[PDB]
Every structure is written in structure tokens, then in C-alpha cells.
Amino acid sequence: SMQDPIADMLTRIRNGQAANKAAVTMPSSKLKVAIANVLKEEGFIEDFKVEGDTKPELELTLKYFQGKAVVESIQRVSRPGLRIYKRKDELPKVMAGLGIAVVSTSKGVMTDRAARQAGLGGEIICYVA
Amino acid sequence: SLSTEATAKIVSEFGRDANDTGSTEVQVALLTAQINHLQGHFAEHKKDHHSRRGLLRMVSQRRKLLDYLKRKDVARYTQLIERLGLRR
Amino acid sequence: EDPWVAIAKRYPEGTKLTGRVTNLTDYGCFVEIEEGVEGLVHVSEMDWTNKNIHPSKVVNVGDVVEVMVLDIDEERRRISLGLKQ
Amino acid sequence: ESFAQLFEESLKEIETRPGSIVRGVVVAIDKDVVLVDAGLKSESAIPAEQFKNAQGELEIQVGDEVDVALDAVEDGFGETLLSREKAKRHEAWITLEKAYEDAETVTGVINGKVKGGFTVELNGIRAFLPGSLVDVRPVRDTLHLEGKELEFKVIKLDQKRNNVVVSRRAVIE
Amino acid sequence: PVIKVRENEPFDVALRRFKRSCEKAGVLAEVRRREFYEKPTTERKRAKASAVKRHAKKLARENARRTRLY
Amino acid sequence: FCRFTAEGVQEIDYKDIATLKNYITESGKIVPSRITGTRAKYQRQLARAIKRARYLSLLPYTDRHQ
Amino acid sequence: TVSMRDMLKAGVHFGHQTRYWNPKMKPFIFGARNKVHIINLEKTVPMFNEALAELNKIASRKGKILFVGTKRAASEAVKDAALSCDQFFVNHRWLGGMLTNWKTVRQSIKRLKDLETQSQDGTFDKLTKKEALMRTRELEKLENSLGGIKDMGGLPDALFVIDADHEHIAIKEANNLGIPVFAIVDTNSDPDGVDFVIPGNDDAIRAVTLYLGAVAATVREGRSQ
Amino acid sequence: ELQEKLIAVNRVSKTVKGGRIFSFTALTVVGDGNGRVGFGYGKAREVPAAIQKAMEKARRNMINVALNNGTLQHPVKGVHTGSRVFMQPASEGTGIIAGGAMRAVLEVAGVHNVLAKAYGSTNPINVVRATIDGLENMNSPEMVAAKRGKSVEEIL
RNA sequence: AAGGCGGCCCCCUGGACGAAGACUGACGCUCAGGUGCGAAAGCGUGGGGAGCAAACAGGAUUAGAUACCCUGGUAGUCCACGCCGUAAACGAUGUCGACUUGGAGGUUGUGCCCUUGAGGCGUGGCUUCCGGAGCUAACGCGUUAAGUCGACCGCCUGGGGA
């Protein structure tokens, strides 16, 4: 069964990147949407577009620079089997700061750097590089 | 399998709308009737293992349904189990 | 259905036919014309030499020729035509 | 633009699948291979033997136009089935023409029956017909001067499998 | 393979016809097959193996054919 | 080149003996679907029909038997 | 420069059968008429133009172009194209490692040249009949193989190709070297090795000729410039 | 200007009707002390010839590596066949902390400061390849910025 | 579901798939212990016994031949009801879900289309082969993954001893 939606989304994104797909569609969720937004902000995707009322479909638009994909790596860290929560001092640095770590904090989902700035840690969703 | 007419009858009785058919209670009833029917068969045909598998599956499904009912709404479940005469 | 119920028209022993060959399968020639049937004229007749013949050398590809039935099985649809006649 | 889309459905409209539209211009001749271009993906490797008429020598130089056939696409590289069958359809049309006035008239000359019907040959092609068709009555063309000139009056055709027996001599009938 | 010699038919021809009939029947082949017991497994194996061989003959060889020998 | 697809028959009939006779051998055997070119779905049905016929002595099991 | 109508007339828009296609050519394909793939002329033409421009540019800096086409239908034509713009060509089978292994092939070329000289300029004659025959044969062989590239000297600065799938060895070599490739690429072919892909019918003769001619013209123009 | 290190030389055999024909494989690696690295694997009946061949191979098909000063830009994994390799950028003074074939490649590349472990297989040829791969994949900050549509200060 | 299942007919009976709708409203996935089903041989009691055939006997072969080959031949194979609980019980590949280029088939539905014809254009299920990216020690796998991921369980830690 479908157990981890965020993870699934990530996987889809990765596959799109691999296969040179322009845009990647999936069933929308609030968390997922937030993640997408974060990605956009950090510049790993071009744009995201949710569409529908009853069962809405999030559509990300993937980015390609000089032939190859932008999202070089994208891993879940927290996962239903084994959750990862970090305190603001223990927050990671993906690719020695060049990549980002999506972290869900009390003040919404944000990149690791942002979280650090705020002065708060939380559940580490995914590393993106 | 359960005859169409019988099924319809079952639906009408247990189902609130009678067009509903998918009500948990209705489903349970349907399962139960089928099980009852198959008992007779299996008394006769003790080595019919393949068929018995299906029966077992049905029973399991029924149990699951009952469980679901219990957590959701207790009174209804109780009523159902009075009607059908399910020990649990 | 359609060629095989009343397969008694070109039957009786040796009714000559004009049929275009289709593909020569190194044992055969496959001349087959008469409304959705299959004939062979395999390698043994074809000429007046038996075994060294190689049907691609001796007749053609896609050509209407001298052939007649010599044999019909209406059951295991193998009408076995000939060409040495 | 939709110039190209419209051009595509236009070019669909101005071709068909069988050998119907006489379109391939003979753009190289070499013995023993003719080759055309009927607005297909590739050029046909035509035999020379689909194009010599009734005595053995070629009839069509560069620019000449015969349709071929279709419905079979790509055996590796190339395009067609032969135009000579094309010709068969034309023959069928002339045979069909009979129906209109209940009499197709050409020349039919039938010397003998391979399988019970004199053989009749029309233009390049020669066809076989059931035994009755050759003669109107019991006249028999064995006493007639060999390979005689009449026409063909049709006696019998098998309509699925192509066997046509036609009526030599007896113009009056 | 029941056969009757036609009126004014040669012997040799008749014999040939009979032979043909027999071949069609696959009687000899059948007999050969039933001479000894083939384990089910063996039977299966032969059938699958044969099929595989056939497939190989059909496709791989066709591919080879595309390219000229000399 | 199946007959039953073109005719568009719902079920093959064991009573229709003539039809069956086209699909049976001179030796009585049922003819392969390679040779007849019968569709697979129909072929099975045909076979069944033949079998039924054989039970009813409408078709023979074999040429030799008596 | 080359119009769409002309291309259509030629038979560029036609491709291969649908079962023989490459899914990397799905962008350049328009549709499938009668179970045969149709190349999108709207996407082809601009690309072609670009390629032509590139070629012209190359010519302008005194670039050496190599024309490859070993189909045997358009062997005559490619040679002609090459000669019109006095450029080099490989109209018969591409020798494996012609460019990558130039230094060995340069010896072969030299040998060929020597043979030619012996044949023509010497005017000695008086040679043992079998030996002479052998020599002649050798010359013929060389001419067939390396006739177009005998005056190339070094490696070419660009590589024009009539079929990518057929001349993949050449393409690969080019890639290895880092020579720009200008391939005509039908639906069955692979465009990944090719730098300046040209979606078009490799097989049809008229189309091939058309492809050649424009290229030749552009080269000439470049030279003039 | 180019520095070239023969990593390993190994004797390899081919059995024939007579007996064993021996030969020698030379694995070399060359670099300019900056980004450019290239390994070469040469083979010959005698050692020196083989080595020469390897060197020649190396000299062509080089590869560029983005180096932030003396060290790497971020921790990078590289795998090839059995040999899977981890290498991590390190502070000036620490030196090349790495083992065997891996060390050599690093040295030529002009990394001065690394912490590098070779997990899995340590078959020189494979491990050098792995190292090369790791180096190659490693992107710089500028490059990343370019990719993402940002400035360098946005990424930090 | 696996083990497996093959003349024809009837009775009882389980599952699968498609077509549209209508309903229920997360009721789901996985599963240590537990429970069941589980080829062949084998066991128990009672039947049956044509063919085949462990054991056994004779004849060959051979240096020997407690084998291969031949002639016989009993348990067994067959049925009923119990037990046994294992097999290279194999795809040597746990189950469930999602995502990622293609081609050639087979089988079984189903929508439209002049079925003008065996067809034309789709859309579902199961399935055989080839092959791309990717993966792999390689062999190979490759939308039925051995690819990219998630959930749960089972299992491995040098060879022998075992």
C-alpha cells in the first residue's frame, strides 16, 4: 500500500529528472505542496501548479540546465518506518551548504538554513542537491 | 454463489435505503448468509479444500467488517450481531 | 469455412490450374491462387530432376504457372499440387 | 503551421493504399531493376518483368507513370508490392464492364483446356476458364485454325478464386 | 488410413497414396512416441525446448538475414 | 482466416454435423487450429462439439472402428 | 534557404515503418500515416537551416568537410556533392578507425598516392603481367576506399553524414575526436552522438540529393566569403 | 609541468598450446597539479613499454575537477565496480589522508588536503576509476548557482 | 495461493476479468507466535489390481557387474478414510503500493467505426520473447526489474565438522 506520499513524490521527481520529463504530476497534499514551494524558492524546479477540486493534482515543472538535470540528488530522511527530528544545532548541511535540507518546523516547512536563521529545528523531510 | 433474488432481499432488509447495497452491515449480512449456505456444502464435501479457501476468506472479511463497525459505532454493531446471531 | 466445405471443384484427379507462386521455402514453392487456399509443389516434382534442384533456380518468384491438384485433403487443408506434369 | 497539418490531411486525401493512382514516375532504369516514386517513404525495387509487354522488351522510359500496390510496409528497407497486379484491377474493371450491357467484347483466343475449360488470354495476361466457357455450343476450337481470333463471351467465373471461362467464335450468339 | 484401389489404377500409385495417407495420419510417429514411457517432466521439457528452438530459428536467423554474407 | 468469426456464431453446435465434418480428419481426428486457421476461442468449442457428437455416434471416433 | 515545399516534393517528410523507430526521435516525429512514421517538417527545417549556417561558418575559416554516405544508392551522389565544392568524402565502406587511427591510414593514403604516380606520371610500363595486374587491383582497392580523402592531409574540422545508424562507427570516431557532426537522422536512427541533427529521410534518393546540394552550396558560399 | 605517477604494474598471463605467455599491465595517472587528471592503463610484453603506453593513454582523455583552493568543495562519494570511495574536504595542513591508488590520483590532481576512505574493493584500477568519477561529479558553488538560477551569496 | 489441474455429461462450489453506473467511506498494507493447504515416495485400516514396476529370480555383458541391456516379477502405483509435512516445493527472485524510453506476439474482455471484408482506431486484464536508460562481479535483469523509492516480514556472516 501507499505508506509515504512525500517519499513517493520525491521518487517521481527523481524519475522525471532521469528520463528528461518536462513536468511531473501527482495527487496533491498540503505538505507536498509546501515542499514543492520550498523547492521552487531554492530553485530546483521551475514552477508547481495544483489543479482540481475533489481530487487535485499537483504538477511540478522540472528544470534542466545544460542538458543534465538540476536535482542531482533527492533523498527522504525522515520516513514512516523511522522518523528523524533534529534540534537547531544538530541541523545538517547538505553538500556542505550547496544543497538544501527541507525541514518541517513549528513555523512551517522550510530549508535548513532558514530554520537555523529562525532559531528552531524539527522533522527533517528530505535532502536535495 | 448467492442467488440474485436472495441477495436483493438481504440488501433490502439490512440496508437503510435498499438501493445502498454497500452498507457495512448489509455487506456483513451478505457474507453471513453465504457462509451459512456453504456450511451445508462443506458438511457433504469435506475434501473440497479450494472451495473452503474462499469460504475462509469470506469469513475473514466479515470479521474485519465487524471489527470496523465496532470501533466506529458500537450500538449498530450490537444490533447487527443480535440480528445475525454472531457470537462475536 | 469458405474454401473448405465444397472443396470438390478442382478435385477429381488432375485438374490443371493457373496459379501465382508466393514464397519458396527451400523445400517448396507455395503456388496458391484459388480463393484462399494453399498449395505446395514441394521439390520432388517441379522439373525432371529430383534432389539437386533448389526451386528458386528452377522456376521464379511471383509467377503464374502450369499447376494442378494431384491430391486434396479437405480436412488438414493440404492440397498437394504438382508441376512435373 | 496548421499549414502542415492541413497539408498532411491534403496529402492523405490525394493518395490511397492500393495500386490505384498512377503516380510513380520512373526515375531510374537499369537492367534488371526499374524504380519509381509514388509519394511513398522509399523507392520500389521493381523487376523488369512487371514491365515488358507481350514480346519481351521494355515499354516505358523515364517519367512514365504506373501505379504499383500497397498495404504492406517495410520489410527492412523499401516500399511496395508490384504494379503488375495493379493491372489486374483494370482487367477486373473491364470484365465487370460486361454486366452493364451483358457483353464484354475484346478478343479471346482459346486453343485448349489445362483443366476442362479452354485458356483465354487478354492482352498480356492469359487466363484459364472452365471447359464449357470456350465454346457456345459443342463446336470445339480443335478444328478451328490454331489460336484463332474471336473475342471471349463469358461462360463462367468463380467470383472469389479467379477462374474465368470465355466464349470463342459464334459472333451471332 | 483406409484406402481402396480405383478402377484401372496402377499398384505403385496406390502404394504411394497409402504411404502419403499414413504420413498424414502420423501413425508411425505416434507409435514411436508410445514405445516407451516419457516422464511428464521430460515431455514438458521437450515441448518447451522445441518451442524455444523454433523461436530462435524464426527471429535471430531473420535478423542475420538482413546483413549480406559476402 | 476463421469461419466462425465471419459467420459470427454464438456457439458451435454438435448437431450441425456437416460443419464439424470439415474440421475432422479422414481418420476421424480433430484438425489443428494451425491448419484450419480457426480462432482459439472457437477451436476449443468446436473440439467439444466434436467430442459430443462422437458420444452420440453422429461422428466416428476413428475410421477403423466398428 | 531550402524551402518546405521542395522538401515535401523530395520526400523528406517520409520516414521508416513504426516498428523500426527510435523513441529518441519522438520529438522530431509528427504522426504515422499508413503505419509509416512522418517526420515533422516544421521542426526539421529550422534545424536544417542552422546546420547549413554552421557549415558555412566552418567553411569560412577554411574548414575541412568530410561527406560520408555508404548506402550504395547515394554513393554516386555524395561524391558528386563533395567534388562540386572541392571537399573530401567517403562514398564506399568507412574503414574502422579512419579518423581515430589516422596515422596508420595516412600510410595507406601515401601508398595509394605512390601507386597513382607509378600508374600515371612514370610512363615506364614494362612490368611482369601478373605483378602489374596485382598492382592495378591494389590501386583500384585504394581508390575505392580512400579516393575522396587522399588530399585531406590531416583530420577534418567537420563531418557531414547521410545516415547516423548506418555510419555510427564514423559518428563515434568523430565524437571521440571532437569533430562536429552533421547527420541526416531518420526515425530509426539514434541522434545522441550527433551534434547538429537533421531529421529527414536517409533512404529516398531525391531527398538525399537535395540534402547534399544545399550543403554543397553553403560550403561554396563559405569558401567565397 | 605535468606530473605522472605509475600506481601499479601487474603481470598477467595467457595460456597457449606451448605454455604461458606473460605480459605486463601498467596503471598510471597524470595531472597538472590543478583540476586536470587522467589515468591510463597500458599493456605490453615488457614492463617499460607497457608503462609508456599507459602514460600515453593518460595524457589523452584527461578530465577537469573544480578545486576550492587545495581541497575539495564538499564530501563526495564515487563508485566503480567493487571499489566504492568516500572523500571529504579537509583543512589546510591535514594532507592527503588516503590509501594506495586513491592517494596517487589525488596527488596529481593537486588536491593537497583530503580525508578519504576506500570502502569495498581496493583493486587499484577500479579504485582509481572510482576516485576519478567522484572528482568529476563534484560540482562547485558557482556551477550550482548557475544550475539553480541564483547568485553565489544566495547559496553561501 | 502454492502443491497442482486435461475424454464427455450432470449436480454442488471457489476465484478472476470486463462494462457501465449506484453504494459504503480508509474499513487498508505487512505479520513473530498461531492456524490451514502442501508433488512423489512412505505409513495405517479396508477395498482393488489391467498395464507399469522398487525388491527378488533367471539370461546376458564384464576382469568382476550385487548395475546399465533382456525375460519374468512382488510391494507400490488405483479407490475410501486417516497420518506424514518434505522436493532443484525454482523465476534458485517474500508480500503490498507508487514511478521511469520502446518493439514483436499470444490469450481473454470491451467502446466506437460505412464489420463497404477475414478488417480500422482505441481501451482494460493475464501472458511469451527481444531490447533502451539504469542496475549488476559479470552473466544478465530490463514497465511481469535484478531500475528508481516506501511499508512490513523472513533469512545470511569463511570452508569443513553439520
Give me the torsion for CA of C40, C46, C52, C56, rounded to 10°. Answer: -70
Query: How many Å apart are D119 CA and I75 C1'?
Result: 78
- Judge residue G162's burial from the number of C-beta atoms within 10 Å of its C-beta, 0-12 exposed, 13-18 middle, 19 or more buried: buried
Nearest 5°: phi and psi at D129? -135, 155
Nearest 5°: phi and psi at H148? -90, -10
User: Best residue in C37, C38, C76, C78 to probe F by mutation, most F CBs within 10 Å?
Assistant: C76
G220 and G139, same structural domain? no
Cell numbers placing D49: 518483368
G72 and G31, same structural domain? yes
Nucleotides on strand I lying under 7 Å from protein C-beta = 1-3, 7-9, 12-15, 22-29, 36-38, 52, 81-82, 96-104, 106-109, 117-119, 121, 128-129, 132-134, 136-138, 147-152
G181-185 and G158-161 strand pairing? parallel
**Quick check: do B and H touch, 3+ CB pairs under 8 A?**
no
Cell numbers placing E47: 515441448
Cell numbers placing G135: 598492382
Domain topology for B1-88: Helix Hairpins (1.10.287)
Non-local (6+) Cβ contacts of F55 within 8 A are none
Which approach determined this entry? cryo-EM
G220 and G180, same structural domain? yes
Q: Does E66 touch chain C (CB under 8 A)?
A: no
Q: How far is A32 from A26, CA to CA, in rounded Å?
A: 10
Cell numbers placing C18: 493457373
Whether the Cβ atoms of residue G35 and residue D61 lie closer than 8 Å to each other: no
Give chain C positions within 8 Å (CB) of D163: 17, 34
C19-20 and G65-68 strand pairing? unpaired
Whether the Cβ atoms of residue C76 and residue F32 lie closer than 8 Å to each other: yes
Give the residue with minimal CA–C1' separation from I133: A19
- Among G8, G11, G9, G16, smallest CA distance to G32 is for G16
For A60, which DSSP code?
A: E
**Domains of chain A, each with CATH number or no CATH:** 1-71 (3.30.1370.30), 72-129 (3.30.1490.10)
- Among H11, H20, H3, smallest CA distance to H47 is for H11
Q: Does D112 touch chain C (CB under 8 A)?
A: no
C-alpha pair distances (Å), F13 with each of D35, F4, F9, F49 = 54, 11, 10, 6
Q: Does D149 touch chain G (CB under 8 A)?
A: no
- G183 membership: H or E segment, kind and range: strand G181-185
- The alpha-carbon gap from C41 to the nearest alpha carbon of chain D, in Å, equals 17
**Direct distance between the N- and C-terminal alpha carbons of chain G, in angstroms, rounded to an integer:** 17
User: What is the residue range of G58's domain?
Assistant: 27-94+158-225
Q: How far is A107 from A102, CA to CA, in rounded Å?
A: 13
Cell numbers placing E33: 512416441
G71 and G37, same structural domain? yes
Q: How far is G4 from G11, CA to CA, in rounded Å?
A: 11
Whether the Cβ atoms of residue H105 and residue H85 lie closer than 8 Å to each other: no
Non-local (6+) Cβ contacts of B49 within 8 A are none
Query: How many Å apart are E56 CA and I20 C1'?
Result: 44
Q: How far is D59 from D29, CA to CA, in rounded Å?
A: 12
Q: How far is B1 from G193, CA to CA, in rounded Å?
A: 62
Give me the torsion for CA of H43, H49, H51, H56, rounded to 10°. Answer: -90
Chain-chain contact of F31 with C76 (C-beta, under 8 angstroms): yes
Whether the Cβ atoms of residue H42 and residue H55 lie closer than 8 Å to each other: yes
- Among D111, D124, D120, D128, smallest CA distance to D153 is for D120
G119 and G41, same structural domain? no
Length of chain G: 225
* Number of domains making up chain G: 2
Q: How far is A84 from A87, CA to CA, in rounded Å?
A: 10
Instruction: State the Cα angle at A69 between A64 and A75, rounded to 5°.
Output: 135
Whether the Cβ atoms of residue A2 and residue A8 lie closer than 8 Å to each other: yes
Cell numbers placing E39: 516422464
Which residue(s) pair with A74 in the sheet? Answer: A128
SS3 content of chain F, % helix, strand, coil (to 5): 50, 5, 50
Chain-chain contact of F22 with C77 (C-beta, under 8 angstroms): no
G36-39 and G14-17 strand pairing? antiparallel
For E20, which DSSP code?
A: H
G108 and G219, same structural domain? no
What is the nearest nucleotide to E55, using C1' and CA?
Answer: I129
- A54 contact to strand I (CB, 7 A limit): no
What is the nearest nucleotide to E36, using C1' and CA?
Answer: I52
What is the nearest nucleotide to F6, using C1' and CA?
Answer: I118
Q: How far is H54 from G35, CA to CA, in rounded Å?
A: 52
- Judge residue H85's burial from the number of C-beta atoms within 10 Å of its C-beta, 0-12 exposed, 13-18 middle, 19 or more buried: buried
Instruction: State the Cα angle at E33 between E29 and E35, rounded to 5°.
Output: 115
Partner residue facing C1 (CB), from F6, F32, F35: F6
- B45 contact to strand I (CB, 7 A limit): yes
* One-letter amino acid for residue H111 of the chain: V
Residue in the block written with cell 522456376: C59
Nearest CA in chain E to F26: E1
Domain boundaries, chain B: 1-88
Chain-chain contact of G206 with D40 (C-beta, under 8 angstroms): no
Non-local (6+) Cβ contacts of H20 within 8 A are H13, H14
- G90 membership: H or E segment, kind and range: strand G88-90
User: Best residue in H87, H148, H154 to probe A by mutation, most A CBs within 10 Å?
Assistant: H148
Nearest 5°: phi and psi at A57? -110, 110
G90 and G111, same structural domain? no
ω before G186 within 30° of 0 (cis)? no
- Among G75, G47, G77, smallest CA distance to G210 is for G77
- B4 contact to strand I (CB, 7 A limit): no
G210 and G195, same structural domain? yes
* Residues G194, G197, G199, G201, CA torsion sign: negative
* One-letter amino acid for residue F26 of the chain: E
G69 and G175, same structural domain? yes
- The alpha-carbon gap from F52 to the nearest alpha carbon of chain E, in Å, equals 22
Whether the Cβ atoms of residue C70 and residue C44 lie closer than 8 Å to each other: no
Distance between alpha carbon G194 and the CA centroid of its chain, in Å?
Answer: 13
Nearest CA in chain D to C16: D115
G192 and G168, same structural domain? yes
Domain boundary among G107, G125, G146: G146
Q: How far is H133 from H111, CA to CA, in rounded Å?
A: 15
Residue in the block written with cell 500515416: G33
Chain-chain contact of F7 with C77 (C-beta, under 8 angstroms): no
DSSP string, F20-43: HHHHB-SSSPBPPHHHH---HHHH
- Among H133, H135, H29, smallest CA distance to H83 is for H133
G219 and G132, same structural domain? no
